[PDB]
Assembly symmetry: D5
């Protein structure tokens, strides 16, 4: 667990939630032996993929965190298409896991309930970190040694 | 089908259903003379393509197993989108069959019914493996030999 | 149109319906004086693109045939997306017409009706092959000759 | 402004009368811009456009894709539109050439006829896509290397 | 961000709204030390991506601006899908931020309200440029220096 | 061998010698019952690969013909290297036999002798076309047929 | 050790008797390793090898390229060797498959005959390249994903 | 040849000889109806390919001009190697003719004799432009038109 | 360099000399905190590059070791050219250092003298590994951290 | 001149000379307005390309400096092939000038005479910096603005 190189890129739109997701990703990392993951912040979720690409050049895994919440127009749908499309492509070009902990909810109560705050049902920041670390460890054993 | 190299990557969300899909894939595999395919477990369906890309380096077919079930948010559609996008890409980049045996249902009852348990109407795990072995055999013939 | 090298790949799901699409593709091919076209069967529509990729290496045109009918879950939508992204990409990678003769219907009744039986209103199987051939001829002309 | 740009136009043939009317719009815009002999290729359906457009983009500064997809009783409209879309988008970026999407996607015949620039049409989408191709080809020429 | 090299590409459909979004982009650029960003016009949203690609070859970031408003037909969906797939591909291919300020609304009232016209609630032009620049700045810090 | 689509590209430097290589290529093509092959002239051997690239898009085989004779400077060596790297690469990119019928001689006398005139000991022009054709036939067989 | 590896061998035909002797070496090594039916294709000259090898590498774990290039009076030896070399090297790395270079490049016929594993030959380069292909195919299988 | 877009990139080492090569290219250009080709000067032959790659984005042909002359070290061969390698690559990646008009001599007298000055035996500058225009015309014809 | 992930690939031709170079690589690795580098053998130099490529997928650097000694024929030139082009391509494709410790000598005395056998003047195995590691370390510092 | 982003990678083999080349590159840079170019050291010249590749991701130009001197074996030739081949490829993948100031001499007096020391005939470190800066400035004017 301890020897993996991990990066976390978190957007800042709905900053409060963003910070709650990043809290659960860090804590997961630190309990697995990783106290100094590369952490980067971006403004919005659309900026995540290009930053994830840069990070995957020299980390074993990248955790993509953020919060998108449906407004009054279709813009929500296109923002979510673009992030889904970018992350999948970056993982496969780089042959590196890019864990998707980007929340996509209709409401703010949904996001708060998915973010690992004191009374949340679940913590997606923490789940996405477990996923990336576990997957990087699986790739390690599949690949060439020794 | 004795001499095809088969790999099965199954995710672990709704882990009771995933084990049943894997069970049917493993039986189909063993029935066509493959007693020990390469089997890999990942956490979540989203992780399937990058592990499947690696497995395709060393195998003639890959079977992607898992279960995504719809909740209260739009997340179900972006998860399903990433899986669909990623596997098709991997199949064409590697010119290797990747069978989609990832169930995408609305309810848990629908998934239970397509995982090949005692009272289930079908087994997609089994169908996914059938399709992957069949295609690998076809390509073998289509491609260069004596 | 006698000069063109034509492959047909037909999936087998709803095999009565796949079988009329294919009868109609071969009628059209024979009526344009074709050298016995290369025909490959596959299990499901999701299998078609990797086999089309193989076939496109050695032919001027590939007709993709099969049938997808909608059920009780979202699966239909992902199956159709996969086929669509796959064919479009295979055709551009190989710069080869990949005709889409893949029905995507709500009901069995609608599919039977577009499959060119005596009482059917349309025949997608035959339409796809005319399309294939015309596009191959056009590209012959557009490309380098004396 | 566009006397030197090499334009190609590819038009599908489903709904013949409307494709003719899109192509007339395209050739008029071209003519008015100094271009009398654009390369023009016909294909049978709109799904065939992208692979013909890709070929046209090797010898041309801009490609105009014309056609008409009209929704039926099945979901099949949605997949055709998806293929066309994804393809022309790949083709333009692979080749670093404008590929103007002049392919109508309507719910009914009435709607298509209204966007093909017939005498009483509200608009002419074939015209629009040519202007768009030609103006993007010119933009890119100034942007690109000259001395 | 005075040493950042910025380009801005604005489509022209709905001229008043674009001029406004372009004006917001440009006021944000000047307010962060950038007097002469490269500014290019195209007619429609869909032309943005190929122009963006030429601009990503010697700028640190590109802002996409334009307006898509829904009508009576399906065409809106395909315009937005095109723009989204295009700009997502352009950014990762060139490893350069393309900030998306393409408005995608159901109504004109909605679009005018997001354009930073005098009575508007927000300006997505202004917002897109803040994103471009922060991201450029982050990449700079992340990349090779010494 | 009647089925194969053959292009010949011959450079024009030492045109008497290029002209016998080409007469010998066409004799061989006609003696295998060929549909009038596509013939293109180019000015010099360095021109051949880009034109071969174009020709390989629409043919099963390309014969490259021309003559390079050594002079007083190192130029000869670079001209021959260029042609070599170009042809080998064009053939692999297009997976198409690109026969090398390009003489590379110290003197004019040696070239005339390998160019298949009555008193010549060899004919490289004719050798290259047999090679072209045989390789195209072999690949037809190796690839996907019924 | 190599019962499960799928081996292809491509051999050029210039200097027929020596190519036969290289191919005999290859098929013996294969047989002794559990492999009785390697895919074997003949091509006319060594410059044809790379494009045939590339095709063989889509359906096979290893390719053995056999042949014989013998220096003449002109510089033309040097370019043939260069093409063969560059090609088999590209083909192996593009396809992530071993392509064993069993192509002799000699100054005289005497030298080639000495490296084709005839009864009095000093060595058999056809044998060597098969062992090399098969041992690299096996290496890469352990290195690659298994469970 | 009126409507071919021509570019000439000349290096500046042995600048008297380079200007003479350029002079012959410019006259050939002007003779076939091209009065203002794109002309670019670089310092050294090694710089030619990356500028030529850029010029190929916007032109149908490119002419590479320059003069490398052998000194006391092996550097002459690696300079010549890089030029040869780089230009061939650029020509095939861009599917655009790049005429090699870079003289590679042993002495300054040999270069003076191939640069098309009053008493020179030939003009390579002129030949390089001839070859590039001729090839661009050929490809135009080979490629798609009415 | 304790956190560097190293692989070493040593060919086997001239077994005593390779064992020696491999021993030098391995003593340098241990002397810089690396107890278990991944060590793989291949038969000949030419097999190095495809193995190197598999190893570059999860190591920070790869050391190539082997011995090529010149004989009576041209073959030596083509073995060295192969190895050089292969390893150069493998490093840039994978953006990973491949340190070249493939000895290329005219005589056996020469090779034994560069192998760090007991009486040797140098050890190019030892040297190649110092290069691998410094370069890994430099890239680490140059790449994304925070 | 002042706005270009410049990197210099210098190997350390023949350290004295290496340092004399780097002195002339820095000084050239500082007189052009560039006081803080990114400077990286590598052990040998073979390590230069992979470091040059990393640097070209975010600089307008890279200057490659070093010294190779022929010894007793052909190793010199292969070291020089690999550097020539790597640098040309890195410049073209990145569309960035990579100035070659890697000296290749038969002797040490030749190197000292090419390195810009008090009594040298020439300074190649300084020439290669002028070349890269001048070329980057030329690309700036060819490319997109304003
Ligand atoms: O050609 C097909 N038509 C269909 O209607 C269908 C197919 N294939 N497949 C699966 C097939 O393409 C692949 O072989 C698998 O992914 C394994 O890789 C299908 O699964 N279907 C059924 C489509 C919808 C029906 O069911 P539900 O009620 O579960 O929504
Ligand atoms: O240009 C077209 N417009 C249309 O409206 C349409 C086309 N083409 N095609 C087929 C064509 O693009 C391809 O030639 C084939 O797919 C073969 O590759 C169509 O099939 N359509 C009809 C779309 C909807 C109508 O019917 P339904 O009632 O079954 O949904
Ligand atoms: O910037 C745009 N905004 C829009 O709202 C719109 C554009 N462009 N375009 C077309 C343009 O990007 C392309 O230049 C062409 O396709 C040719 O290449 C649009 O067609 N629109 C309108 C979007 C839909 C409205 O209406 P109805 O559905 O009623 O026709
Ligand atoms: O993380 C985000 N969450 C959101 O909810 C949201 C973001 N980002 N962005 C934009 C951002 O990713 C990019 O920074 C820009 O496009 C510029 O490149 C958003 O625009 N949103 C809002 C999505 C929906 C709500 O609004 P409306 O009421 O206008 O539909
Ligand atoms: O396998 C070969 N061995 C050789 O020694 C040789 C071959 N092929 N070829 C040609 C062959 O590879 C290709 O079929 C053609 O080039 C067409 O693409 C040869 O030409 N050779 C002879 C090399 C040297 C002899 O003669 P000269 O005296 O003219 O230099
Ligand atoms: O590591 C090696 N060292 C050498 O000195 C040598 C090798 N390999 N190989 C072959 C090997 O890398 C490849 O496995 C095969 O080509 C098949 O793929 C060699 O052939 N050699 C010998 C180099 C030349 C000597 O001799 P003569 O010129 O007298 O035959
Ligand atoms: O086919 C050719 N044969 C030759 O012998 C020769 C050619 N072409 N070319 C040039 C040609 O391929 C290109 O068209 C130019 O690069 C322009 O792009 C030649 O230059 N030659 C002459 C080869 C050597 C003679 O001369 P010197 O005495 O100068 O060494
Ligand atoms: O900059 C260098 N100059 C040289 O003269 C030289 C270097 N590097 N290298 C090796 C270096 O680039 C790499 O660090 C290693 O291969 C490991 O990757 C050298 O080996 N040399 C010496 C070149 C020739 C002299 O020796 P011989 O007497 O053994 O022929
Ligand atoms: O296999 C899965 N099935 C599911 O149903 C599901 C999964 N995975 N995942 C996780 C992703 O595969 C995961 O690995 C992350 O993206 C981290 O990279 C899920 O998040 N789900 C839930 C989808 C639907 C449920 O709920 P709401 O919309 O109510 O939130
Ligand atoms: O056009 C050139 N002609 C030449 O004869 C020559 C050039 N350029 N260059 C420079 C490269 O194009 C240059 O741009 C650098 O590599 C920096 O990137 C040269 O260095 N030369 C000289 C080659 C031969 C002379 O001498 P010695 O071997 O005696 O040192
Ligand atoms: K990585
Ligand atoms: K939390
Ligand atoms: K595979
Ligand atoms: K089961
Ligand atoms: K076959
Ligand atoms: K084809
Ligand atoms: K029928
Ligand atoms: K073009
Ligand atoms: K009209
Ligand atoms: K410009
Ligand atoms: K950029
Ligand atoms: K505004
Ligand atoms: K950094
Ligand atoms: K071909
Ligand atoms: K003849
Ligand atoms: K393989
Ligand atoms: K033998
Ligand atoms: K492994
Ligand atoms: K061009
Ligand atoms: K002149
Ligand atoms: K043509
Ligand atoms: K690596
Ligand atoms: K040692
Ligand atoms: K750069
Ligand atoms: K100096």
């Amino acid at each position: 667990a301890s020897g993996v190189r991990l990066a976390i890129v978190a957007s800042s739109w709905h900053g409060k939630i963003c910070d709650a997701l990043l809290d659960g990703a860090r804590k997961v990392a630190a309990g697995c032996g990783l106290d100094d993951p590369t952490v980067v912040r971006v403004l919005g979720a659309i900026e995540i993929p290009v930053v994830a690409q840069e990070l995957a050049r020299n980390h074993d895994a990248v955790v993509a965190l953020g919060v998108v919440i449906r407004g009054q127009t279709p813009h929500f749908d296109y923002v979510c298409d673009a992030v889904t499309q970018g992350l999948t492509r970056v993982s496969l070009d780089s042959s590196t896991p890019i864990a998707n902990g980007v929340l996509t909810t209709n409401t703010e109560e949904q996001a708060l309930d998915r973010a690992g705050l004191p009374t949340s049902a679940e913590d997606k920041g923490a789940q996405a970190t477990v996923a990336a670390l576990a997957t990087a460890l699986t790739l390690r054993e599949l690949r060439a040694h020794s």
